[PDB]
Write an enzyme that holds these catalytic residues in place. Sequence first.
Site, PDB file in Angstrom:
ATOM      1  CG  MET A 243     -31.938  51.527 -31.208  1.00 23.70           C
ATOM      2  SD  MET A 243     -30.401  51.686 -30.283  1.00 23.70           S
ATOM      3  CE  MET A 243     -30.353  50.111 -29.435  1.00 23.70           C
ATOM      4  CG  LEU A 244     -29.497  47.703 -36.007  1.00 25.43           C
ATOM      5  CD1 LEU A 244     -28.699  46.741 -36.869  1.00 25.43           C
ATOM      6  CD2 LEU A 244     -30.703  48.224 -36.778  1.00 25.43           C
TER       7      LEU A 244
ATOM      8  CG  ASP B  55     -13.044  43.730 -33.040  1.00 26.71           C
ATOM      9  OD1 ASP B  55     -12.745  42.551 -32.744  1.00 26.71           O
ATOM     10  OD2 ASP B  55     -13.390  44.576 -32.191  1.00 26.71           O
TER      11      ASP B  55
ATOM     12  CE  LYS C  33     -17.443  53.380 -31.891  1.00 28.83           C
ATOM     13  NZ  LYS C  33     -16.936  52.635 -33.079  1.00 28.83           N
TER      14      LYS C  33
ATOM     15  CG  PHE D  53     -24.037  53.903 -35.980  1.00 23.60           C
ATOM     16  CD1 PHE D  53     -23.427  53.673 -37.202  1.00 23.60           C
ATOM     17  CD2 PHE D  53     -23.260  54.339 -34.919  1.00 23.60           C
ATOM     18  CE1 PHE D  53     -22.071  53.881 -37.365  1.00 23.60           C
ATOM     19  CE2 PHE D  53     -21.905  54.545 -35.075  1.00 23.60           C
ATOM     20  CZ  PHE D  53     -21.309  54.318 -36.300  1.00 23.60           C
TER      21      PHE D  53
ATOM     22  CE  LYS E 155     -18.315  53.945 -19.378  1.00 26.35           C
ATOM     23  NZ  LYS E 155     -17.775  54.260 -18.027  1.00 26.35           N
ATOM     24  N   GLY E 156     -16.638  50.925 -24.461  1.00 22.45           N
ATOM     25  CA  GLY E 156     -15.471  50.277 -24.982  1.00 22.45           C
ATOM     26  C   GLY E 156     -14.264  51.161 -24.867  1.00 22.45           C
TER      27      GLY E 156
ATOM     28  CD  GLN F   4     -19.470  57.019 -21.813  1.00 20.95           C
ATOM     29  OE1 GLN F   4     -20.051  56.567 -20.831  1.00 20.95           O
ATOM     30  NE2 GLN F   4     -19.348  58.310 -22.050  1.00 20.95           N
ATOM     31  CB  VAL F   5     -22.585  52.635 -27.684  1.00 26.08           C
ATOM     32  CG1 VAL F   5     -23.751  52.617 -28.665  1.00 26.08           C
ATOM     33  CG2 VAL F   5     -21.266  52.398 -28.409  1.00 26.08           C
TER      34      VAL F   5
END
Length: 346
Positions: A106-107, A153, A54, A104, A33-34, A38-39
């Site tokens: 998934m890594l 960032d 995301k 995105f 979460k940011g 959220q992710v």
Amino acid sequence: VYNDGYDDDNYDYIVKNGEKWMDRYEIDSLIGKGSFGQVVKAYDRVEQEWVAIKIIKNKKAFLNQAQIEVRLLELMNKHDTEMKYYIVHLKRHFMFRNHLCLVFEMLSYNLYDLLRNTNFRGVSLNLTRKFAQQMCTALLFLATPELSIIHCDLKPENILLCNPKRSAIKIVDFGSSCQLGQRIYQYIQSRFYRSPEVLLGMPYDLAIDMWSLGCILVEMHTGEPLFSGANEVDQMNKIVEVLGIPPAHILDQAPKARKFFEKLPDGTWNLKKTKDGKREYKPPGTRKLHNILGVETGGPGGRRAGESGHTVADYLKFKDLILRMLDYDPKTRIQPYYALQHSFFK
Ligand SMILES: O=c1c(O)c(-c2ccc(O)c(O)c2)oc2c(O[C@@H]3O[C@H](CO)[C@@H](O)[C@H](O)[C@H]3O)c(O)cc(O)c12
């Protein structure tokens, strides 16, 4: 109460594990979460692969910034598959229940998690070299004239491993990024990795990401942040301990120069004097990176004596490249193409 019951009181989508979206995505778990939202980890049933989604907050200011993020990701896609990779690929974007969603690949986990796995002893200089080469290649991609994208960032958390057993990495999260001609924020970068020009309130360009990279690479090998300032004044002072007073021709054009420094009548700049009987910082430029890296004493903790790729010559090359990445002047700071030519690599 909020968004027909789908949102909490902070504009975030209430994540419920197992929910199916659009007969395609099976939400698996919350990743993080940011401030953006959220992710989540999810399974794409149509393409039969794992993805990260995301979920942007259902709020206009966050939706608009994520729309810039999508445009930047799409711009990188028009060049993608045809230029330096090492950037997390946007697979899809769509609106879902008044939330902008970014899909995105998934890594694995990020470079800080890798540091924590080693109990912050740091990774070898050979692995740091591989990370450095891939990140300089990714920065070279962002430096493409049609792109000119500033990530804004760069930090260990925003560099992801492709596979926890391999050295392949990718840059993630362009939610704060901007093009060179479209700068809108001034309080950018995470503090430990914030460039001097941002601290001094000066106009910035793509060179701020290279400064962050220099801080990241040292931390990756030592296990600890190079400049761990608790606030902006403390951050600038920890930078000065290692690199000294910034050049006068920079401080003379810095709007926030007197937030940290003083100009004596002779035109020479000095640090603002601390208070009373308080312990002073190390004198400017006396916390040598030569000793932070342990160039002549077997590396950080002395654990690298006799290790291949950790010769004194190797540490001297690494120190030289880092100092070029930590140049105070953003116009002379080493650029991605020439960092890749540095003898640290070949
Ligand atoms: O594949 C992904 C993945 O494995 C992860 C991820 C792995 C490990 C973690 O410890 C973690 O917290 C996140 O996050 C992802 C994302 O979120 C980012 O995560 C970062 C933390 O690393 C934060 O710093 C960023 O703010 C946040 O956007 C994506 O935006 C896109 C992705 O494709 C992934």
